[PDB]
Design a protein around this nucleic acid. Sequence first.
DNA 1: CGGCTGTACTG
DNA 2: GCCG
DNA 3: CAGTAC
Length: 322
Amino acid sequence: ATNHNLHITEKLEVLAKAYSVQGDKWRALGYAKAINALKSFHKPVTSYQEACSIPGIGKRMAEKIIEILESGHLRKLDHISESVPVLELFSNIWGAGTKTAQMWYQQGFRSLEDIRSQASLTTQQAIGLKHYSDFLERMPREEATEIEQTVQKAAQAFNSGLLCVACGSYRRGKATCGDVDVLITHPDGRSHRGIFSRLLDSLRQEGFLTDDLVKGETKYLGVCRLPGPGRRHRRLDIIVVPYSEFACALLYFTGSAHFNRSMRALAKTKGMSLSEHALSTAVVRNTHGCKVGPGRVLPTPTEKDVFRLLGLPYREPAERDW
DNA sequence: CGGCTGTACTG
DNA sequence: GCCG
DNA sequence: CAGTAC
Ligand SMILES: Nc1nc2c(ncn2[C@H]2C[C@H](O)[C@@H](COP(=O)(O)CP(=O)(O)OP(=O)(O)O)O2)c(=O)[nH]1
Ligand SMILES: [Mg+2]
Ligand SMILES: [Mg+2]
Ligand code: NA
């Protein structure tokens, strides 16, 4: 729908990122939740009591909401360390998180050029840096489509049965995608094996894969570029999963991140655990509470089965932003 | 006040 | 940050 | 393990 509280959320996201780039992840999280609630509220919040009655907004956040509602500004926004923009700049480099941004800043660096030349970069960060600009641009949905087909085409050349599906923001129907997350599996439950390596080599030869950021037996985080004049380098993820965990893999991979964590929260209450691998029962825990026995798996052939089992009404991918 | 998702590759 |  | 990321 429409965000009847934009005048508020914009001020808030500013403080939210402030805390975020600074490493205060938990406080940032509180704000993120707050903002998602604000956005999806049927009307402009008009009173402090009204704000509080909303889940994810407590005394503290309500105070801020009202001050903006009445002043159109948030005092808090004027006392934000002048280091935030540089920390944001540095943490925008894929592979570089808040600890690295903070390290570089105390070392005196202040620009990507400072980093590029002087600073010490891990192999990933170097890749993150050379593709800085391209990585902040959200690609058109159409380009995501092209990338999914590329992967799927190269994958079917090893097996016609292999199933390739673009997830994340793409399956949620967004018009722009930060990256492309492709999930690959196979109906027979066994053919997905031993093809990951060769599929990557194939795409790497074809020139499509330009750089590798992370290689796992079943997980791949890399960089790609479509054939054609002046195409940008797009960040790409690929995960290969056995057919049995397909529903969960697809659920996890479609996200969003907050929707996922929210489902996993609920899962734990009902005494269960939800992971990209499966929906299970309460894990066994000893006197201290330490995992000692994995819960048994509840078959979930489809995403619908996962919601059903958690007592939740099915939600289309496009309505899973959080 | 303590939890706030669960899991995985890199160095 | 918020919540149980 | 610390850091980063899905
Ligand atoms: N449980 C869990 N799932 C996650 C997490 N991060 C990502 N996922 C899942 C859900 C998420 O949908 C998927 C891909 O993550 P991205 O590609 O980083 C963000 P996307 O939503 O795709 O949108 P984009 O901004 O790319 O256009 O992995 C996380 O922290 N936890
Ligand atoms: Mg994505
Ligand atoms: Mg991704
Ligand atoms: Na980063």
